[PDB]
Amino acid sequence: TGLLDGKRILVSGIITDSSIAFHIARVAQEQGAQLVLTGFDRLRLIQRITDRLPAKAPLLELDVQNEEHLASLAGRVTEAIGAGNKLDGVVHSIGFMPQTGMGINPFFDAPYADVSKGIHISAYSYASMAKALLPIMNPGGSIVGMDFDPSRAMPAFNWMTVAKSALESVNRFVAREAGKYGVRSNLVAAGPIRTLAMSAIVGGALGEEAGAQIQLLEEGWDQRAPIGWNMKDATPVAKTVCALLSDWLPATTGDIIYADGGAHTQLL
Amino acid sequence: TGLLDGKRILVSGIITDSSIAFHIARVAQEQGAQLVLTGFDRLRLIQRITDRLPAKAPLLELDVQNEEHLASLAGRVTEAIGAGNKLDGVVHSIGFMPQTGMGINPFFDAPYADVSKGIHISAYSYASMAKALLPIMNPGGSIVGMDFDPSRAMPAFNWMTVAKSALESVNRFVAREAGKYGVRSNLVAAGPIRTLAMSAIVGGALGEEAGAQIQLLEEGWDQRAPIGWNMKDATPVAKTVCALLSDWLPATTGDIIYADGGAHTQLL
Amino acid sequence: TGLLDGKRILVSGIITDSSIAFHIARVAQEQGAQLVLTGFDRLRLIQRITDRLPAKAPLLELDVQNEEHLASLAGRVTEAIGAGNKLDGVVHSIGFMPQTGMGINPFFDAPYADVSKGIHISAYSYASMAKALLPIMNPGGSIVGMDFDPSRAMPAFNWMTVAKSALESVNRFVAREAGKYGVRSNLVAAGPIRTLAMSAIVGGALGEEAGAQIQLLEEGWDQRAPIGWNMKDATPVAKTVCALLSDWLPATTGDIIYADGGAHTQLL
Amino acid sequence: TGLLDGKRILVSGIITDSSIAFHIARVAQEQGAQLVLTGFDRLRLIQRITDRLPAKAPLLELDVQNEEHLASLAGRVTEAIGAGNKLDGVVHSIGFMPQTGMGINPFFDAPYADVSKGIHISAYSYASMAKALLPIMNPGGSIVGMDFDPSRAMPAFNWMTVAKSALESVNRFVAREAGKYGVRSNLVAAGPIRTLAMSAIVGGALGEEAGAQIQLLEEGWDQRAPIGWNMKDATPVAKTVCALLSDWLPATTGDIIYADGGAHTQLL
Ligand SMILES: NC(=O)c1ccc[n+]([C@@H]2O[C@H](COP(=O)([O-])OP(=O)(O)OC[C@H]3O[C@@H](n4cnc5c(N)ncnc54)[C@H](O)[C@@H]3O)[C@@H](O)[C@H]2O)c1
Ligand SMILES: NC(=O)c1ccc[n+]([C@@H]2O[C@H](COP(=O)([O-])OP(=O)(O)OC[C@H]3O[C@@H](n4cnc5c(N)ncnc54)[C@H](O)[C@@H]3O)[C@@H](O)[C@H]2O)c1
Ligand SMILES: NC(=O)c1ccc[n+]([C@@H]2O[C@H](COP(=O)([O-])OP(=O)(O)OC[C@H]3O[C@@H](n4cnc5c(N)ncnc54)[C@H](O)[C@@H]3O)[C@@H](O)[C@H]2O)c1
Ligand SMILES: NC(=O)c1ccc[n+]([C@@H]2O[C@H](COP(=O)([O-])OP(=O)(O)OC[C@H]3O[C@@H](n4cnc5c(N)ncnc54)[C@H](O)[C@@H]3O)[C@@H](O)[C@H]2O)c1
Ligand code: NA
Ligand code: NA
Ligand code: NA
Ligand code: NA
Ligand code: NA
Ligand code: NA
Ligand code: NA
Ligand code: NA
Ligand code: NA
Ligand code: NA
Ligand code: NA
Ligand code: NA
Ligand code: NA
Ligand code: NA
Ligand code: NA
Ligand code: NA
């Protein structure tokens, strides 16, 4: 019946009802998965948001920069899903770069402390979460992280693009470790999605020049994509994550699946 | 229930019960698809082989070098599935290179007539089949072709690797045309599979040097793959094709999905 | 003194004074190389054109589809440069695709006979020329071919882009063969250059839609290139070919050097 | 005469007479460049080492993690080369990862503080140096950094490979900034070179497993490279850096030139 029937899956990264991870969680539940959610900092808000998912799911606190949160995560997950049960899936949908590393602020003016925080949250934490959770993952399991194609430089996204380049490299090493558990590790490289932060940026939150550049980027994406690209609809991305969480891509690991309308395959 | 329930899917490329397309067809039927099969030249043999699939499927003759076969294909498919019905999926699992273009024969000694025949069958025909079948494909449909990663030169596969480089390029253009129909086009890049031809080559059919090189290639593949690689098991490849035929990769087109154990993501 | 002082270098592909190979030949002579030229079909025209190069150079006929021309080429070169002398460099600057394979004519409507001729001239002939000339190349020599980045599909260039994908694959195999002679093989992927044919296409020779698409492609190239791109100036491309012909890239082979203003490294 | 005659070029990264930057500096001086050198921490040692270069060159202290060193660098360079003179070239040959991020120590056990230091020195500092030096670079200038192909995960190099993935991304953004000055930015991806640190690692300094894996990596490199690979000879790498510092790759930026014997173009 459901693509993910019986699977136990941890989903990080919900902060609003427009988070990509909110849609990942909704579709996974539609497909029969039993979820455990993790949230950062504003847990009352996240609980109120995820009350709207089609099924109940326990919410655990996880700041990926907090060593104590990471050290206790597996035991808290096991308590939530029951002793003797393990996870079949993990979704990393976590990203952050201080404002100095994006938008109008010149690329050269981002101090390393800011870049380092952004790489910690956006790239290193993919390894951190796999380290914490692989000991409680079943063979045949799947770890999926969210990516944005960084193979070519862009306007505005600056150091966040560098962080995604690092994340793609981290994923290839996580795949080596995860394989020892019979677990796959892959990224979904999505086209642009109008999350609250992205809408705020297009609205000029990081400077008019950066907002204009990002609006132009979105327009070219739908133009290039042979099947089009709808930045207001995260469901195609959520479905692709669920495909990697399923048993139907069993020989793919260390890899990147592009849920971008095909835009990255076309020049114009 | 089934991943492909209700979908009508054409599968080319069955010649033995170890053909990758035989396993594609079996898994697709297991997942509820209604198939139409195409075969080249030895139709009594192919019918006897496909009698072992879990469900009946009409068999149509298709030599992709035959313009008349291509011009009549859509009408013959429609007759097989019924007027007013269209295809949801197409599988291209067709490849050939004359012996002069592979194995012990020096790369420089393949005459162009032989290379051209191999590129016709292995690359151009992906465009030929899409041209013939897109007019009878439903929106939301999917065209999938079989690939072998040609981004780096290898021993022995010589001009067939060139043909796959061409195929990957053709796929990106087919995606442009298919998008106008609401149809996706993608390739699955598989690791090595012990088909009858591959077993015969490892056995020395194309020279001892080529057999030795191919055996070494297979060994390195399983070694590199973080989840391993079983050349005797086509099912992981067949499942990946079915994933692309399903509705669960709806924003991927013009693209390549690697069903190779992750080997291409690792150096050693 | 000269970058190429004392080197003997064969340059194919001159047909007008705006051919990329005309500028390759001029710069190579400026840098002290002694050239042998090859031309296709219109030899009186090519001789009149190359009379304007800074130094004399013998002109040999070479139709790369003519097996007899290829079989006699080495002996004719040796006669031109003197017994006991060998070539240090070879430049392949040859490309062709029938009109049916480019521009307004739909991608699906190019007959295979036309595509096959274009792949013969544009891709297979890189292997043909290396086969003919490696027996008369010195260790430390260099073979260079002209490329146009085909990693993503474009409007209009259709089957010529497929042919470049094939050429890049051929180059990686030629490098394997050339290495046995101590010879390197590489491609230069150039940005768009306003040759006579390209000007004619922008002028609508292959349909208004194709001319418009190509003009848009040129505009985006200069916009993306961090150092800009001047389609009216082939000299930066010619210099890059000369760099690969020199001794200053001695550990690069099977590879692609991008002389494109950096455009392919940037999204926008 | 000399490839770099009259050019003023800053070279970082000398620590021993087997440093890649020592050979870069030697070849650049052989080709007529006037150098300024930067060294980290052990300046008496570095001065004694660089006394063996064919020409005198002033040595400036530069710890790329020291904001004060970076803020004063341009003024100290100008003092060394004379008011009214600017640099034509910059060589970044700087890399470091704490031991916890390489070798026998499990990938997951590297603490982020260590990874962050390694990314600071190995990747961010490429942007730091360009920021400091672009204001005193001439149009037509060239910035070159040293890379090791990180597109596929490897044994042992672990987080240093992640750092190179980040560096490649940084280079594409530096190219955008440098283009405004008429300056190119590129990396040379070298094959393995037996520096003192690399010899020490093969000797087991980071665990026997890591030493064995690295020795196997070197062996496969020479085997794959169509022209071979000599890990005891940095001169082919130094020459390639000088090519990018010259005027002979004037349309290449944001890019990576592979000085690796062609190994990355071949599977086996
Ligand atoms: N929106 C897009 O266009 C787009 C495109 C491609 C990929 N992505 C990626 O998708 C992922 C989800 O981002 P989103 O667009 O849904 O935005 P979002 O703001 O909805 O989600 C980002 C999440 O990161 C979490 N986070 C930040 N710091 C954290 C910490 N220290 N510990 C734990 N969690 C932390 C936030 O709480 C938030 O839940 C990110 O990796 C993002 O880069 C986004
Ligand atoms: N076996 C492997 O290791 C491997 C790995 C990756 C990709 N592939 C690819 O998978 C596809 C299927 O090959 P296979 O390994 O299953 O071998 P196979 O021999 O079982 O199938 C090849 C098919 O091509 C068909 N064919 C040949 N000429 C034809 C023509 N003129 N018209 C129509 N059909 C024609 C043959 O009849 C045969 O059915 C090919 O594209 C192949 O390159 C194979
Ligand atoms: N102009 C561009 O924008 C551009 C960009 C990147 C790469 N290129 C490539 O550069 C190379 C040179 O093309 P060009 O732009 O200078 O155009 P051109 O028309 O000046 O040169 C093409 C050459 O191919 C030769 N040729 C055609 N058929 C032949 C045959 N059968 N035998 C021998 N030679 C034959 C022609 O005689 C001509 O000399 C081609 O490979 C082309 O694809 C061109
Ligand atoms: N040896 C190889 O196999 C190889 C292969 C490809 C690329 N590389 C790269 O070449 C570059 C040079 O490395 P190498 O192999 O010549 O080793 P090396 O040890 O000789 O040089 C590394 C340099 O980095 C400098 N450095 C470290 N911390 C610094 C700081 N805080 N500030 C300024 N400088 C600092 C060191 O002083 C040293 O001079 C590195 O980027 C390295 O990753 C090396
Ligand atoms: Na959304
Ligand atoms: Na649930
Ligand atoms: Na941690
Ligand atoms: Na579109
Ligand atoms: Na099989
Ligand atoms: Na059926
Ligand atoms: Na046809
Ligand atoms: Na393995
Ligand atoms: Na010109
Ligand atoms: Na000459
Ligand atoms: Na020939
Ligand atoms: Na520009
Ligand atoms: Na050395
Ligand atoms: Na000097
Ligand atoms: Na700094
Ligand atoms: Na070799």
Author numbering:
A (entry chain A), B (entry chain A), C (entry chain A), D (entry chain A): 2 to 269
Task: Quote the paper.
The enoyl-acyl carrier protein (enoyl-ACP)3 reductase InhA is a major target for the clinically relevant antibiotics isoniazid and ethionamide. InhA catalyzes the NADH-dependent reduction of enoyl-ACP in the biosynthesis of fatty and mycolic acids, which form an essential component of the membrane and cell wall of M. tuberculosis, respectively.
The strong difference in Dkobs between WT and Y158F indicates that the Y158F variant is affected in the protonation step. Although the Y158F variant is affected in the protonation step, the enzyme can still form the (2S)-C2-ene adduct, which then decomposes into the final products in solution. This result is in line with the fact that the protonation step—and thus product formation from the (2S)-C2-ene adduct—is impaired by the Y158F mutation.
